[PDB]
Amino acid sequence: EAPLLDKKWLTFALAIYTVFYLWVRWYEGVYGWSAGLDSFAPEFETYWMNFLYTEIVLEIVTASILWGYLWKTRDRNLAALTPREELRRNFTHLVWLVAYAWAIYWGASYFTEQDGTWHQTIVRDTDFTPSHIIEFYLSYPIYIITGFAAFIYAKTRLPFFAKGISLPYLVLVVGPFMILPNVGLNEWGHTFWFMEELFVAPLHYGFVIFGWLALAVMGTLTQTFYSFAQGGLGQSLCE
Amino acid sequence: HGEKSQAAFMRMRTIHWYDLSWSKEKVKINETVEIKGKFHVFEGWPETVDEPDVAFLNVGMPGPVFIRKESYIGGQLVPRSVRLEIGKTYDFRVVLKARRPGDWHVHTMMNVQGGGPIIGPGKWITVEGSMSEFRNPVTTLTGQTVDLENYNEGNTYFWHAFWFAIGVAWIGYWSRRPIFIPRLLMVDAGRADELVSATDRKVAMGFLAATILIVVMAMSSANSKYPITIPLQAGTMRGMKPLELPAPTVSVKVEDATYRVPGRAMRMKLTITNHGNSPIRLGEFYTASVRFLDSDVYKDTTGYPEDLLAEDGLSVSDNSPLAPGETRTVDVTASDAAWEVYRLSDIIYDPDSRFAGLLFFFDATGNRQVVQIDAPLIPSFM
Amino acid sequence: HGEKSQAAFMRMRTIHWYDLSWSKEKVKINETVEIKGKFHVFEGWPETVDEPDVAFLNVGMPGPVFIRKESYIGGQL
Amino acid sequence: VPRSVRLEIGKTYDFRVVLKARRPGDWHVHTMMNVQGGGPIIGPGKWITVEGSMSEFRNPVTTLTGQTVDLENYNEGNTYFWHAFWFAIGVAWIGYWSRRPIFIPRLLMVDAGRADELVSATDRKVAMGFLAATILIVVMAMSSANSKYPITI
Amino acid sequence: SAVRSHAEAVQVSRTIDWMALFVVFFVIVGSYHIHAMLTMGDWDFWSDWKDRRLWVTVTPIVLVTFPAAVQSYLWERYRLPWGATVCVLGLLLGEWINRYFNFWGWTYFPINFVFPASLVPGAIILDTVLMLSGSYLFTAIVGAMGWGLIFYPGNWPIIAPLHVPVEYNGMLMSIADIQGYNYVRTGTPEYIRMVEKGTLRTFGKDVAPVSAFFSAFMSILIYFMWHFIGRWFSNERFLQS
Amino acid sequence: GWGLIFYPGNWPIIAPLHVPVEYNGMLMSIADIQGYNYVRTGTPEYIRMVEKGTLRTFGKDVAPVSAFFSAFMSILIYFMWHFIGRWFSNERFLQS
């Protein structure tokens, strides 16, 4: 008779992102000045290019392992899922959504405007600035991994989402992912199209457009609520 | 920082910064440093850079470690964008005030609209002290002296916190009840009208009226407190006075200019005609912030950034007094690690292999003539 | 009419009209009036006004109360 | 002036053009100034007669790498070879599927719900091999071209 | 059954309410913040960009986007009238966090030079109009008019002390202008700022009201379009491929 | 993949045409000399939309950046033209 909501998992989901991104901010503060200013220097290499390579390799490994583990341990027979266990799985999926929202805030909101700050205070020299390394290649893949994991868990554990591919969930999960390829346009926007460090330039409208797809969350939320209510919780609550 | 990654020919063919001075190398907090010099606009302006019809004199540094107290182009203060003419030389002066301690690489730059950044030579300046001692006093036309570091901070905090608290209260008034699932079921069941009561309507009306009235009263109070206000001052300042410089009594033609691609040097054949000004001798070749000097003819005493100063990087086949009238063809060799360090050797990736730079000629009395050269640069691979 | 509402600095920094003459102050119908003068273009042209690469010499009046018989800039129609 | 240039209104310029005869016949030759945002400005045309055979025309050019080439036929065979190679690969890919019934029986099977029977494991292996071979061949060809011509601008 | 009693169901529903509020709030923070910054953030970053023509016109038009969709979802499905307020609060929270911890904590730009614009009154007006009227067309028209018109009066108490004239080195300057001049933005030259510079067709002290009315009209249009955009975004559809 | 493989696939063909030449004192490409010698009367030199270098152009990243931008826009255009073709495949009959 485990509790319906696992408080330890929710606390971990918040705390791991909080601590990791606080350490990332500390690293940016410590080494963003001594080594990050000049891109053709050895300290810049050993303090940011190594970071980029390590983060890319770790992101690939983590995404592969997590997605493969979630897809391998799927519930083959969901017809025997008891309503209480279905409610517990719904709470776990809600914890996954909480983690995805926290990662989305950390990526799209915090580090994007930090990148804006960085570009307004220095002269851009390379596409692999420390700000670009942290924002485009660390936070965006992290929230992409979290969203893919949440979608896979919902599809493989919740009977509500197991009957097909949820269009609002697919838009909410893949839409922000398209922000990562669009970075190329951003680079093509800064190197060829726009000669000025203007944050409202059209070369950034790609980001904006895919950010709009995050609004799909509302539709997803509705489905989630029905997944919470179809198991008998709604009937008891309406009384 | 940011020049090494810029195309070599773009750096060679835009703006040339010649004799520069820094008043101090180490400053304390609140102390001022003056950077003066001359900048020449190259006649063969690249086509992908818009003409400097709208240009801004800027200071390149990792942030507000200094504050730009003032900037003058031709003796005229230039807080706004200005208009520069192709082929003219201008004096510039920048007075900065130290704000944050540490070692800072400071550059003078010309931001050009439709072109991008044009960074000049950077110098390392050390600031000693504490940032807490920095003050920025400004006296207004209303008779008030304020400190720009903390002026109007509390008012902004108060108003933002007030409006955020109002929004939080508006959300929390509705947040005391069941939020998502029961309300969704009631709306689906057709009982939506039961979710809003008359008291809720009265609360919404009060919120709207209070918001409008508070905004109006706050605007009136702000107008009363500050009855004298002006809009933001902006515009492009034309009519910058250029330098009226002695035309070079020295004529230089570039026969050939080549660079070995592996390579840390550049070589050029030059025909030089002296049109008076006594026997002259080449003492320096300036390319892209890099100065190659002939120690026997000239020595820098201005503290030019050493990473960009090659004291004996100019090798002239015959650097003997060029008697007025003599037309000598000489082979000059500009060699220095800066060629590779500042990635000037990356002209091999450029869609335009042409260079431009400045040659400095000195007579027996020390008078200096500046000659401007431009040519195509041919890589050597054999 | 229409100048009082134009920005003061824009009026100060564009074109200066110096010595001007009007041939007549009171005219009959079908009679002609000549307005001559000099205009100087200010060197510090405002940036929000395009350079006078395409400019037209016009007469400001509430309509065709007159008809512009001719106009000359530097002696050229 | 191998590139576009900038001209000033009201100025006079000398111009010289050296041309080399390539094809026989009578040709009306004009000197012109193409102006961007304006169009063509044609000058006086003169009739010039070229006598000989086009097969005798040569265009020798010496590169900075020490190689002398003829621009009439330089790099022609390489372009033909690569285009023919890729066209043959595409034709083979199409013809692998073209050995079976194409349009009507496959359409009926898809409509009947038997689409999964139209692709077998061998077809999947062939597609995987085609993709891997294409990527590997592109990479190897780029490496070989870089090795053959290490100096490019 | 999933729950054993009505009280347990109520407690579970409250927990779901809190968690879903967290999810909605922070997803809105991320998406709205990225959209808002990449649409109008140059005027929002610096105090010398807060002019009467471009800032006042542009900011409400681009910022009315998310509140329209979130209102169209929340009021229709839950009768929750706080969509615009929650969007504005999330955007303000993200912006202030970045200003304090990155603009000032990292690059040491003074807070009085880098502060966001106030947006709560417009969201409150929109939310109250939607709640009291109950119709999206009237809400669109009147609430968007109010949202566009109240933007500059709401922010005037903050920026008014920054417009005191100063005779700086012989030239007339604003306090915000001196702030922009002294604190060097290496990547942001002076010519980039889209601020009013005066036109020969500019009339007698009508810049700010005209900008506000134009912003209100375009806010009406953008609210009308984004209501249906959000209606599409709220679809509960399932795909089979 | 379609966006990224375009330039590596064509490099073996155009690589011999990029050998530098000192043509009449100016550095030229073999393709540049081909364009110079063989006169296109209706195609002047200023029309060619080719890279000329920008002050924001960085250290040898032109081709990869162009390839990645092309790949992203190819994703977008493929997504739109899939539905365009789906509409074009409709078997509808009209009565007027």
Ligand SMILES: CCCCCCC/C=C/CCCCCCCC(=O)OC[C@H](COP(=O)(O)OCCN)OC(=O)CCCCCCCCCCCCCCC
């Ligand atoms: C479990 C916690 C609750 C969940 C929410 C997360 C809240 C956590 C906040 C962490 C506070 C400590 C920050 C100090 C780091 C402490 C820290 O890392 O200090 C070192 C750096 C400075 O290093 P340096 O650059 O080498 O130094 C030279 C120039 N300073 O400062 C900082 O990083 C401080 C500034 C940035 C701190 C981040 C802001 C706090 C994060 C808030 C997240 C938003 C949550 C919303 C909730 C409403």
Ligand SMILES: CCCCCCC/C=C/CCCCCCCC(=O)OC[C@H](COP(=O)(O)OCCN)OC(=O)CCCCCCCCCCCCCCC
């Ligand atoms: C945010 C941008 C919105 C994208 C457009 C909306 C999606 C397309 C709708 C119409 C066609 C599909 C059917 C209904 C949708 C939902 C959907 O795709 O359902 C699966 C259907 C198959 O289902 P069915 O039972 O056979 O009948 C059709 C369902 N109405 O797939 C399709 O019809 C084709 C594939 C769907 C389109 C791809 C996924 C769209 C998600 C965004 C992609 C990423 C782009 C953004 C990145 C920045």
Ligand SMILES: CCCCCCC/C=C/CCCCCCCC(=O)OC[C@H](COP(=O)(O)OCCN)OC(=O)CCCCCCCCCCCCCCC
């Ligand atoms: C390639 C461009 C696509 C054009 C748009 C698609 C055609 C229009 C569709 C909606 C209205 C018609 C009904 C469905 C279509 C097919 C169609 O036109 O059917 C006949 C119907 C009448 O049929 P019905 O049984 O009464 O019920 C409607 C059928 N869905 O006509 C109409 O409804 C009006 C005339 C149709 C439109 C003109 C022909 C379109 C062909 C292209 C014209 C040339 C332009 C391109 C030249 C470069």
Ligand SMILES: CCCCCCC/C=C\CCCCCCCC(=O)OC[C@H](COP(=O)(O)OCCN)OC(=O)CCCCCCCCCCCCCCC
């Ligand atoms: C010490 C702090 C608290 C405890 C730590 C555990 C988490 C906190 C709370 C919930 C569990 C508490 C008790 C658990 C005891 C034991 C424990 O560690 O349980 C958690 C999982 C087991 O997951 P489960 O079987 O679903 O069952 C969980 C319900 N108790 O442990 C594991 O070993 C992980 C499971 C296998 C999946 C691994 C994921 C792939 C890893 C590779 C990297 C992925 C990518 C990285 C990022 C890029």
Ligand SMILES: CCCCCCC/C=C\CCCCCCCC(=O)OC[C@H](COP(=O)(O)OCCN)OC(=O)CCCCCCCCCCCCCCC
């Ligand atoms: C689908 C996504 C489309 C974009 C919609 C979101 C807003 C994004 C960008 C534009 C916002 C304005 C700020 C500039 C940032 C976008 C940006 O960077 O704009 C640069 C220009 C100034 O530089 P520039 O050298 O002129 O460059 C032109 C590139 N757009 O700003 C401008 O605003 C001026 C350009 C002309 C556009 C005027 C604004 C639109 C006026 C209203 C009509 C449009 C319809 C409105 C709805 C009724």
Ligand SMILES: CCCCCCC/C=C\CCCCCCCC(=O)OC[C@H](COP(=O)(O)OCCN)OC(=O)CCCCCCCCCCCCCCC
């Ligand atoms: C940051 C500062 C935070 C400000 C907090 C403001 C408080 C907000 C809301 C209070 C909710 C109370 C609702 C009571 C209804 C609770 C309610 O509905 O009670 C039944 C009354 C019965 O009243 P009655 O006498 O029979 O009829 C009216 C004439 N006598 O109905 C009502 O209609 C009562 C309406 C009262 C509504 C009060 C809300 C006004 C709030 C404005 C706040 C101003 C902002 C601050 C100014 C600086």
Ligand SMILES: CCCCCCC/C=C\CCCCCCCC(=O)OC[C@H](COP(=O)(O)OCCN)OC(=O)CCCCCCCCCCCCCCC
């Ligand atoms: C312009 C030059 C033209 C190039 C022509 C290339 C030939 C193309 C296709 C051959 C089709 C054979 C299919 C046989 C399956 C015919 C087939 O499916 O046979 C059953 C086998 C059984 O094999 P098994 O041993 O039981 O299991 C595998 C390990 N033993 O299944 C298979 O899966 C066989 C897969 C074989 C597929 C071969 C295709 C590879 C083609 C690559 C061509 C490379 C391009 C040229 C390089 C220069």
Ligand SMILES: CCCCCCC/C=C\CCCCCCCC(=O)OC[C@H](COP(=O)(O)OCCN)OC(=O)CCCCCCCCCCCCCCC
């Ligand atoms: C509507 C309910 C009635 C309440 C009053 C309404 C608003 C106030 C006054 C109405 C009288 C009109 C004259 C304004 C005072 C007129 C007024 O106060 O004008 C101030 C300045 C002028 O400054 P100045 O020259 O130094 O002053 C001398 C003027 N000879 O103009 C402006 O601010 C321009 C007006 C603002 C732009 C809006 C124009 C309206 C466009 C139509 C669409 C908007 C309407 C919505 C339709 C539903």
Ligand SMILES: CCCCCCC/C=C\CCCCCCCC(=O)OC[C@H](COP(=O)(O)OCCN)OC(=O)CCCCCCCCCCCCCCC
């Ligand atoms: C149009 C609908 C009628 C109701 C609104 C009244 C219409 C007139 C003005 C309001 C637009 C904003 C102010 C700028 C005008 C246009 C206007 O009058 O601008 C002049 C100054 C701004 O000038 P500046 O050069 O920046 O110097 C600062 C001096 N204040 O603003 C004002 O004088 C403010 C005028 C009114 C302020 C109160 C706003 C409240 C009304 C708007 C909300 C309506 C929502 C209704 C809810 C249903």
Ligand SMILES: CCCCCCC/C=C\CCCCCCCC(=O)OC[C@H](COP(=O)(O)OCCN)OC(=O)CCCCCCCCCCCCCCC
């Ligand atoms: C700036 C101008 C205002 C913005 C425009 C939107 C305002 C309102 C309505 C106009 C278009 C949306 C109405 C919904 C379509 C209309 C709509 O709601 O659904 C149409 C169907 C629904 O999918 P279905 O069930 O599979 O199809 C069978 C019919 N139910 O979409 C499709 O079939 C696919 C196309 C849908 C594309 C709509 C996406 C909405 C746009 C998101 C982009 C961001 C916003 C851009 C504007 C800036």
Ligand SMILES: CCCCCCC/C=C\CCCCCCCC(=O)OC[C@H](COP(=O)(O)OCCN)OC(=O)CCCCCCCCCCCCCCC
């Ligand atoms: C993905 C699976 C793992 C395999 C490796 C992936 C690709 C290779 C390396 C990864 C390390 C990153 C650093 C690159 C080597 C870095 C590298 O080789 O850069 C070469 C040149 C730089 O030339 P240079 O200055 O003379 O050299 C000195 C540099 N200090 O830059 C480039 O070519 C620019 C990079 C290409 C543009 C793409 C940027 C990425 C944008 C994000 C969207 C695309 C990603 C897709 C998302 C799914």
Ligand SMILES: CCCCCCC/C=C\CCCCCCCC(=O)OC[C@H](COP(=O)(O)OCCN)OC(=O)CCCCCCCCCCCCCCC
């Ligand atoms: C992004 C997804 C990961 C997989 C692809 C690897 C990503 C990196 C580069 C590939 C883009 C094309 C090359 C230009 C880069 C960008 C890059 O590296 O450009 C430099 C040169 C071009 O320089 P130049 O000035 O024109 O001089 C010629 C010197 N070669 O290209 C390269 O060095 C080529 C790099 C890699 C070539 C192999 C391409 C194979 C990978 C792409 C296909 C992937 C499809 C996967 C199928 C599922």
Ligand SMILES: CCCCCCC/C=C\CCCCCCCC(=O)OC[C@H](COP(=O)(O)OCCN)OC(=O)CCCCCCCCCCCCCCC
């Ligand atoms: C560049 C951006 C990507 C291209 C855009 C297309 C990508 C995918 C979806 C977006 C629009 C097409 C979806 C089909 C409509 C959606 C569609 O498939 O059919 C809508 C109905 C079908 O006709 P019906 O049976 O009579 O109506 C009852 C509903 N079945 O069309 C209509 O009623 C008439 C309008 C249809 C017009 C669609 C034409 C497609 C465009 C062709 C132009 C060329 C492409 C331009 C883009 C560059």
Ligand SMILES: [Cu+2]
């Ligand atoms: Cu960008």
Ligand SMILES: [Cu+2]
């Ligand atoms: Cu530097």
Ligand SMILES: [Cu+2]
């Ligand atoms: Cu010069």
